[PDB]
Design a protein around this ligand. Structure first.
Ligand code: XFI
Length: 372
């Protein structure tokens, strides 16, 4: 009953239905592995269809404390409290959880997104105001018998969030695991990057400067400057039969082709090798252009298919965002401090190339690829 419990619009996150309060108030909540605060619109906003009304909930408890949360995109402020929370198409349990009631925001809510709040699924270490504000998933595990694991299958769009377990119908082939380096973000280690099989040939610490994270709340694959610049050069080289404006590579401009004529084959596959569970072993996940060229739906441009380049630069480390997660089944195995990847039942592929999760690979160089 948890399969197909996510929806979304491209570039605007994936969301699950939740209820808050007594009697229950239904809200759509963005699933975010890149933060640790559960927060809901709690006052009118031009882009909110609905919001949390604390005065209607007899189970609301005010914590008499404000909270401010800034993201890489957007920010909000609100009032902390606790209330009863359910997930109608998740586990059939009700938990008392911390909730930030958003009273003011800036460039957070999105016009016509269909979500009204955000579920930070990462660890307390990055919760605001500090790590004493217990995250939702921690509360869920403590208060119920739910195993300490969830999985995401991100595929208008849809997918599944499976809480407490692994649904084998959502993937094919083998699950490969990479260790969670530190429990704050879902921090992982990239050991190697290839573009159409060609190694970028950097010290592997560069790939993880200053961390690498798995983040369902960020649209793009974001790369440290040095890595981003090297990747763009290699992708340009591979696709050099067509020349695109500089603005395209910066994500500031769309690239468009006559409907149905997108030249997928001129764009390369990107392979990210992730640290394995055994010394100097790794596995790779392979990303097709159908993943990193994000379609932008617009009826005005619909004689064409138009795309945004969804790889972008970062000054805060690698972010493996939604365009990386889509087409994989990603298991957040908190119990065993590891993240698993497998090929998803929902995958794009064309008749020539297929996204993959494969291994093992061995590396001679004994360098630790962690930045810190
Ligand atoms: C990086 C980490 N996780 C960010 C994530 O929590 C946040 C959630 C969110 C979802 C929907 C609307 C706003 C915010 N996602 C983003 O910040 C986000 C969302 C979409 C696109 C982008 N990208 C971006 C990057 C830089 C500048 C502008 C846009 S993109 C276009 O490259 O895909 C970012 C994070 O910041 N975690 C914080 C959580 C709170 C404590 C401090 C750490």
């Amino acid at each position: 009953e948890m399969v197909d419990n996510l929806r979304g619009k491209s570039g605007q996150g994936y969301y699950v239905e939740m209820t808050v309060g007594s009697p229950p108030q239904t809200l759509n909540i963005l699933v975010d592995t890149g933060s640790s605060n559960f927060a809901v619109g709690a006052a009118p906003h031009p882009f909110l269809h609905r919001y949390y009304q604390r005065q209607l909930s007899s189970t609301y408890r005010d914590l008499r404390k404000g909270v401010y949360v800034p993201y890489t995109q957007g920010k909000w402020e609100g009032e902390l409290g606790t209330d009863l929370v359910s997930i109608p198409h998740g586990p059939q349990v009700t938990v008392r959880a911390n909730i930030a009631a958003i009273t003011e925001s800036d460039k957070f809510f999105i016009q016509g997104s269909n979500w009204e709040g955000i579920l930070g699924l990462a660890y307390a270490e990055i919760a605001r105001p500090d790590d004493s504000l217990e995250p939702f998933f921690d509360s869920l595990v403590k208060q119920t018998h739910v195993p300490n694991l969830f999985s995401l299958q991100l595929c208008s769009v849809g997918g599944s969030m499976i809480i407490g377990g692994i649904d084998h119908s959502l993937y094919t082939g083998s699950l490969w695991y990479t260790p969670i380096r530190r429990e704050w973000y879902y921090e992982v280690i990239i050991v190697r990057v290839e573009i159409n099989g060609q190694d970028l040939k950097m010290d592997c610490k560069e790939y993880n400067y200053d961390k690498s994270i798995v983040d369902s709340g960020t649209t793009n694959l974001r790369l440290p400057k040095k890595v981003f610049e090297a990747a763009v050069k290699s992708i340009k080289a591979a696709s050099s039969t067509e020349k695109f404006p500089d603005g395209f590579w910066l994500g500031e401009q769309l690239v468009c082709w006559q409907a149905g004529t997108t030249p997928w084959n001129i764009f390369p596959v990107i392979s990210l090798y992730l640290m394995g569970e055994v010394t100097q072993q790794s596995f790779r996940i392979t990303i097709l252009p159908q993943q990193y060229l994000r379609p932008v739906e617009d009826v005005a441009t619909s004689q064409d298919d138009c795309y945004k380049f969804a790889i972008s630069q970062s000054s805060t480390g690698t972010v493996m965002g939604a365009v990386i997660m889509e087409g994989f089944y990603v298991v957040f195995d908190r119990a065993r401090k590891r993240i698993g990847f497998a090929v998803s039942a929902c995958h794009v592929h064309d008749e020539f190339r297929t996204a993959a999760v494969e291994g093992p690979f061995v590396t001679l160089d004994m360098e630790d690829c962690g930045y810190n």
